[PDB]
Nucleic acid binder design. Structure first.
Length: 55
DNA sequence: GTAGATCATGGAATATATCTACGCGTAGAT
């Protein structure tokens, strides 16, 4: 996640400095929950980034 | 001689989306 999805999701940060963090900084584990499979904004951007990465 | 018993004597207005306070589960740091 922080290797590839984070730089495309987190727009303005140092990617190497992003490589040494916790998943919640970009996923938002305060919410998290199986609700990521729903229609939430982070789900939207994650799906967009995944679809762009693998075309 | 008298008192009691006997006999005579008689026409025609409801449900729902929204605002707000609180505990709190988890995230972050080390």
């Amino acid at each position: 996640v922080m290797g590839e999805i984070a730089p495309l999701i987190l727009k303005d940060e140092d990617k190497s400095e992003l490589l040494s963090k916790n998943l919640s900084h970009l996923l938002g584990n305060s919410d998290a929950k199986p609700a990521i499979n729903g229609m939430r904004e982070m789900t939207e951007k994650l799906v967009t980034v995944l679809e762009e990465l693998t075309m």
